[PDB]
Write a protein that binds this DNA or RNA. Structure first.
Ligand SMILES: [K+]
Ligand SMILES: [Mg+2]
Ligand SMILES: [Mg+2]
Ligand SMILES: [Mg+2]
Length: 155
RNA sequence: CAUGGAAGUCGGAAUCCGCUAAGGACUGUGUAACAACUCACCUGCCGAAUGUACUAGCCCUGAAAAUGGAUGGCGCUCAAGC
């Protein structure tokens, strides 16, 4: 009746995976699972979505482990950026993440599907649209103006 | 975005909606980071006022000299003062 030892852990604060070893002795000690397996699993999961931690969730399954992604709107907005983030430059201005605000971001918002009520996606789409206030949407248009000016369709 | 580590509170730069009557992509304590405690903010109780800045009357502070001492003296307090 081990029940696979359901344990949930979070891995973030990084860029483009990295395959870092250990760094989670507390996670490893719980469930008698090898930390290297979880680190390798998390690195593989984050390899697909580079330059964005996306808050990977690690689930302990007996001696094995499982990887899960959050599909966060902010993580997707981080992915929708200007090209890739080169190394040896993250200490400098990392503002080079400006992309167009269009239906691609609108569809990417549908992953949440209004988890916190939001009265369906009517307020969820506008809220996820306004989430990209750092890049100010595309050109002179702004996420604040896009969300405030209610003229587009609901979906 | 920074990252052995920063989950609001090393550090650089903006400020969204669902939920309500109601909570910040945060004031402060705090963790390596969480957390907790908050706090802002809202709500139970209560039953009539409350806050800030100014104006000018009396009184008080500012107000230290040489023999013992002078509202003329005694004394006077809802005055025997203004
Ligand atoms: K007289
Ligand atoms: Mg005399
Ligand atoms: Mg007389
Ligand atoms: Mg008189």
């Amino acid at each position: 009746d081990p029940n696979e030892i359901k344990i949930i852990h979070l891995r973030a604060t990084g860029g483009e995976v990295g395959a870092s070893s250990a760094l989670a002795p507390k996670i490893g000690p719980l469930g008698l699972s090898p930390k290297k397996v979880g680190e390798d699993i998390a690195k593989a999961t984050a390899d697909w979505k580079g330059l964005r931690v996306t808050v990977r969730l690690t689930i302990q399954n007996r001696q094995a482990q499982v990887s899960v992604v959050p599909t966060a709107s902010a993580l997707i907005i981080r992915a929708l950026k200007e090209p890739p983030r080169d190394r040896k430059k993250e200490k400098n201005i990392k503002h080079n993440k400006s992309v167009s605000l269009d239906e691609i971001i609108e569809i990417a918002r549908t992953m949440r599907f209004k988890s916190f009520s939001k009265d369906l996606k009517g307020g969820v789409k506008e809220i996820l649209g306004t989430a990209f206030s750092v890049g100010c949407q595309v050109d002179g248009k702004s996420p604040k103006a896009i969300s405030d000016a209610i003229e587009a369709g609901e979906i």
